[PDB]
Paper text:
Here, we determine the high-resolution structures of cyclic di-pyrimidine-synthesizing cGAS/DncV-like nucleotidyltransferases (CD-NTases) in clade E (CdnE) in its apo, substrate-, and intermediate-bound states. CD-NTases share an N-terminal core domain with templated and non-templated polymerases of the nucleotidyltransferase (NTase) superfamily, but the C-terminal helical domain shows a higher degree of variation. Three conserved acidic residues in the central β-sheet of the NTase domain coordinate with two metal ions (A and B) that are essential for catalysis. Based on sequence conservation and structural similarity, it is proposed that the cyclic di-pyrimidine-synthesizing CdnE proteins, including ClCdnE, EfCdnE, and LpCdnE, form smaller donor pockets that act as molecular gauges to recognize and retain the binding of pyrimidine nucleotides but weaken or exclude the binding to purine nucleotides.
By including substrate UTP or UMPnPP and cofactor MgCl2 in the crystallization solutions, we obtained the complex crystals of ClCdnE-UTP, LpCdnE-UTP, and LpCdnE-UMPnPP and refined them to 2.6-Å, 1.95-Å and 2.2-Å resolution, respectively. In the LpCdnE-UTP complex crystal, similar binding modes of the donor and acceptor nucleotides to the active site were observed for both protein molecules. In addition to the Mg-B ion, the α-phosphate of the donor UTP also forms a coordinate bond with a Mg ion, Mg-A, which further shares the Asp67 side-chain and a water molecule with Mg-B in octahedral-complex formation. The other ligands are the Asp139 side-chain, the ribose O3’ of the acceptor nucleotide, and a water molecule. The γ-phosphate group of the donor formed four hydrogen bonds with Ser53, Asn59, Lys201, and Ser220 of the protein in LpCdnE, showing remarkably stronger interactions than those in ClCdnE and EfCdnE. Besides the bond of O3’ to Mg-A, the acceptor ribose has O2’ hydrogen bonded to the Asp67 side-chain. LpCdnE binds more strongly to the acceptor triphosphate than ClCdnE. Although there is some disorder in the β- and γ-phosphate groups, the triphosphate is with hydrogen bond to the backbone N of Asp124, Lys125, and Ala126 in the βC–βD loop, and salt bridged to the Lys125 side-chain. Instead, Trp277 and Trp276 form extensive hydrophobic contacts with the base moiety of donor UTP/UMPnPP in the substrate-bound ClCdnE and LpCdnE, respectively. In LpCdnE, the Glu262 and Gln274 side chains also come together to form a hydrogen bond and restrict the donor-binding site for pyrimidine nucleotides.
Residue numbers in the entry: 2 to 87, 96 to 300
Amino acid sequence: SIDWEQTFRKWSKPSSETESTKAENAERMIKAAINSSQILSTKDISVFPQGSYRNNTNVREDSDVDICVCLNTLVLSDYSLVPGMNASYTYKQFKSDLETALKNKFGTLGVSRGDKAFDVHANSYRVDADVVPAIQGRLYYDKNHNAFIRGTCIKPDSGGTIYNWPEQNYSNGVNKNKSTGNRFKLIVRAIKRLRNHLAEKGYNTAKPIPSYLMECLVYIVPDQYFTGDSYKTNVENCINYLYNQIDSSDWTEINEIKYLFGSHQMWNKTQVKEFLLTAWSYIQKNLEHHH
Ligand SMILES: O=c1ccn([C@@H]2O[C@H](COP(=O)(O)OP(=O)(O)OP(=O)(O)O)[C@@H](O)[C@H]2O)c(=O)[nH]1
Ligand SMILES: [Mg+2]
Ligand SMILES: [Mg+2]
């Protein structure tokens, strides 16, 4: 007998009241690591927060701050939408120099290299951050030199190319929060805590559902479903809409550029539907049946 209205209202809160301070500190310290690097301080590099701290969708106190370190002067362009359309400092050298800069500022005990990002955990600066090296990415929509959208590009150690759209994610999230009178991100956080709750209780359908996927999914739900004074009704509306529309959908991420499903993603629609069914059952009272 969970009071789901009061539970979702509680779970709609930020991870803490000091999120902005944690994110500011992470960003400042990563910039300081760059500035103290002889090689990197001479480069056109942007350091910025992304992820749930930047978007105010974080719910875990122990979430690492996501920091992007972007070398703006290396460009990778996607020409796939335009019929017929087609340096000395490399991404690999950049990533190695970034690893060295982070080890120099925070110590080797505070830095590990993953496939995509560096894990920085340095009690001395109170920094817990996932620091990803990126370059400028572009998606062309016409053959003219100016006809592109700008984002970031990641080149993992294991190969391949990842396009990200952090500024577009942030702006569209802000706009939807405005259009819903702040209910959008409240419900994102409520649903992220619901997922974490189910995963901690051993529900296997909740385990392959990542935070960013849920943020994208809730963004997809039309604004009308966020109205009213019942957070429980909002959450139910989200589950209902998503479950009944996902099969025929061709949805994008919150940036409205990248497709939410496909071979470029680690999640699929079947996982999402199974999680939605689990969440729908768990939220009900006095259910006598189980499948
Ligand atoms: O599969 C992914 C994962 C991550 N990302 C991009 O990297 C950002 C940081 O990756 P995170 O996994 O940390 O997601 P998050 O910050 O939104 O959620 P929590 O930490 O609160 O769990 C994400 O918000 C997303 O923008 C993707 O584009 N695709
Ligand atoms: Mg994060
Ligand atoms: Mg992260």
